[PDB]
């Protein structure tokens, strides 16, 4: 992973975002979601990610 002063941004477009895969890395210390509830992320379309 890059340093905080050179953070790496990855474009995500034209795909299917199955967010259930996110919990493969189970030990999550923080999962704060702003604007969107983490349970409803599988029923929304996003312009750009």
């Amino acid at each position: 992973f890059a340093s905080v002063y050179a953070w790496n941004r990855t474009r995500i477009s034209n795909c299917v975002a199955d967010y259930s895969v996110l919990y493969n890395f189970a030990p999550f210390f923080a999962f704060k979601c702003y604007g969107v509830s983490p349970t409803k992320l599988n029923d929304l379309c996003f312009t750009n990610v």
């Binding site: 604007g35 969107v36 509830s37 349970t39 409803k40 029923d43 929304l44």
Partner: protein
Amino acid sequence: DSLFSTPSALGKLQDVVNHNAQALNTLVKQLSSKFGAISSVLNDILSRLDPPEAEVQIDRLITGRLQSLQTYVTQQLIRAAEIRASANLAATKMSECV
């Protein structure tokens, strides 16, 4: 001749129509406001947030739309009292002049 030519002759009846039609445009254009919520559409708030957090954003819409309705009704009661004043004057002229 003084009514088919002069355009602002029936300016008292047309002004009554304008005020009531202008208050409805403002009432229905207040549905696009957010009043602090993340969106002005209840479907967006319901389909993006959990029920514990949706009630927080929704209550901002309700208290803002509820205050938009009270402003419309209160000014409608005030305006309907001007009309009844002119309706009582026209009923007096109809029975005394006519």
